[model samples]
Target: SHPALTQLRALRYSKEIPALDPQLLDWLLLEDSMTKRFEQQGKTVSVTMIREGFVEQNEIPEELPLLPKESRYWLREILLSADGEPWLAGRTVVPVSTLSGPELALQKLGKTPLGRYLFTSSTLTRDFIEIGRDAGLWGRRSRLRLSGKPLLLTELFLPASPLY
Candidate 1:
């Protein structure tokens, strides 16, 4: 039997392994762009805006497992804007597993420097601005408690809109 969709807050959840409903899955996919370049007649041609964003991170382990004592993970969400236009939109989960030390990792993932992840979504140019938003506010907080420890994050991605 398929799992029934459980509506929680503004999001839905299902315990079943296969979530086939298109409406449910749509929320899981974030739109992205892929560019292709070709060389012709000593000139280069490119096709842009190829819809992408199916990429997913490796599954989070039930437990952090045996990591290097000095190793720590950094996860953050960023907001991206292109030429004053909100083009690419989404969040990023950075897991820096191997670090020189916890203190160094914390320093690198500090709130100030962590804002740079927003630029990762900017494909066309490195020049863009952050609008100061957040994507998964509650989700990250819940995840942090489950993971245990200070899960570094940034509130710079747009919040999820109301479903209704």
Candidate 2:
């Protein structure tokens, strides 16, 4: 099954991910705002939105084995950059239940760092990370909660990096 089609909770930081080098491991297992980390390190991070749309329920991850059939969701993708270079490909998924008030207003933000909302929101929380390494590159995914609702975000570290 595709990674998205499986129970994401049972997933772990794969042996394929950590320990190759301490630096890479630090970035891979990061539990905070990845955008802030890169930018504070003097690397410019930019978001290039790829797609934002609904995911078929079958693609939903764990903790949702019995999700109500009437549920809805939205997802998006963007590139994290470093001085005009792509370092990360990020995908964020949210349950439509959160699409009201402040959370709803944020869905339309342009070119801004999603981390601003994720790291600062009083309602924000993140789940355990699952590591993925395929095609010679690595990535991480986790379930994030905001305002008591759940969402998922996954980031793939692209091979085309100037700083690596």
Candidate 3:
């Protein structure tokens, strides 16, 4: 199942989610790379690109800002781990229209962490994050524009993650 969208309850602030653990909420509000954050904790972080392909419109959550009606959506999924334990599941939705010019680099990120690319890119701008909760897990999603073209990025903190 899609970890972030399966049972999403979206909010503008971590305080909007009831009874969320403070530590977990902090992680949910993080604006930096999960890969770097995990590495700072002295763990060997890695990413496994689990899925990369076009997906049906219904699979995309309304939490994302409106996208082009006729554009195809490319879904990218990855399992991020630290010390061989899966800690985060990330889902990215890219409109086919957003993949031109320098943004074309998004297509074959392969073993590279998506956060690394987003933060390092010169023309990218990130929006305010929207927080979410699904049962016990907490997650966040944001709309980012590369060269003024929009896409969505969502990350879910798994139960095994240090955020717990």
Candidate 4:
């Protein structure tokens, strides 16, 4: 098993979670880039790389699509901070095949919020957002398509977040 992989219950729809905090709900359902939103809120955002590499089967989210038949996946995890406090932890899974042409930039995004790239692209398409709770923290995952290729992104809000 991979060490330090995020361990949480299966993600579900927003209505399925019990008494979700109002503030957290707003951020969870945001339709645009959280990084840009943080910037719009006048918060200095930063990203700290946690870990990234080819991961084992157990590390992949069950909700992730199984198409393309590529057993190999590249997983990148990072912490998104606002004004020096770590607020959100992000985990992104990309099928090995998806990394090609212009998308090869995914591997080199050190200390950069994935949002900076995702939302800026014209070809990006978003799927449903699924919310989950682990311990006392709230999180969400959404499937995004870049130029019609699929990837899964999971974001977990931390206790330090002011949204509490």
Candidate 5:
């Protein structure tokens, strides 16, 4: 780990996650679709896909198991913008175990909202939530299961949001 990240282990649990003066909590604690919440800002929220492809197992957070390492999975990163201004970012990891499912088409959803697919899935299951501080930003990560296989998503708040 880099020196900075190594010293920034201020991660807290979901319920105990702190809403410090420099951070926003309402959206951080939201259980509904995040894309919807950004749109609720009464602005044109858009998703800008950054990158998605197979990555090393180390990219998966340590909180998740390192099993099923034989099969390389897909890792996706996206930037969230509203009215042409960037406010947040998201990263997702899809296990190879889930790549053969019908919903695996998510790999092709260019600018579509991921929160939409997650909420609408019949087999969607959310595991634990974790909040952490990096540099000066606040973020949250969760383990979600699509068809019973683990997928990870993390959202990072940035400067342009109404509150960040």
Candidate 6:
């Protein structure tokens, strides 16, 4: 089934809104001034991306079942931009071993006080991209410094809302 359909079903709508669709309503909730206010007031937090290729493969333990094989392992770098300068760089390996699954792992990474800062920064970057796309600000090339780099940085779009 389509992921959106699955999500909608999981939300368990009792009845449709008189005129607005639930998905649109959800989107509106995101755009609501009050919601934005909370974010600006420091209530909502976000995560930041980090650079990850520096860690040696030997640092990873072989006994962890969650750890992928070296041949399959990938590194992702996180970079944040200043007004015109880039700073606040760090690295986090993809497929890192965690007792929780991938989503949970990411949350664990992003929920820490420091992680939340990065999470919010990354989220703000993505929201700009999304709003740009919707507003016809589409660009074929990414302005990110590591755009052409070989890495698998995960961009956070929305807060995780797992159904199960």
Report the lDDT of model 3 for residue 84. Answer: 85
Worst 10 residues of 2 by lDDT: 1-10
The local lDDT score (0 to 100) that residue 118 gets in candidate 5 is: 53
> Residue 107 deviation, candidate 5, in Å?
1.3
What is the C-alpha lDDT profile of model 3 across 10-121, one tens digit per residue?
4232425445678766666665558888877899988887788877677665633456654478888888988888888887888888888777777777778766445455
lDDT string, candidate 5, 1-164, tens digits: 32222222234435366745533566676643467777877988788767777877776654346335645678777778888787777777777776765667757667887774453554766776678766677677777766677777767776676665
RMSD of each: 15.4, 5.0, 3.6, 3.4, 4.5, 15.4
What TM-score does candidate 2 get on C-alpha atoms? 0.72
Best by lDDT: 3
Residue 89's lDDT within candidate 6 is 27
Ranking of all candidate structures by their TM-score, best first = 4, 3, 5, 2, 1, 6
Top model number, TM-score: 4
lDDT of 4 by residue, 31-146 (tens): 55578777666789998887888866666746455434467778888878899887777778888777876667677677877764553454777766777776777777777777
Give the clashing residue pairs of candidate 3, or none.
Answer: none
Tens digit of per-residue lDDT, candidate 1, span 19-78: 335742332221211101001122322212212122223322211322222333443322
Candidate 4, overall lDDT?
0.69
Clashing pairs in 4: none
Q: Each model's TM-score?
A: 0.23, 0.72, 0.76, 0.77, 0.75, 0.23
Per-residue C-alpha lDDT of model 6 across residues 1-164, encoded as one tens digit per residue? 22321222223211222234665444423321112332443344332443233344653332123234444333433332222222222223434332132233343443232232333323222111111111111111111112111222221122221100
What's the residue-level lDDT of 75 in candidate 6? 42
True lDDT of residue 21, candidate 1: 59
lDDT for each candidate structure: 0.24, 0.63, 0.71, 0.69, 0.65, 0.28
Candidate 4 lowest-lDDT run of ten: 1-10
Comparing 1 with 3 on TM-score, the higher-scoring candidate is 3
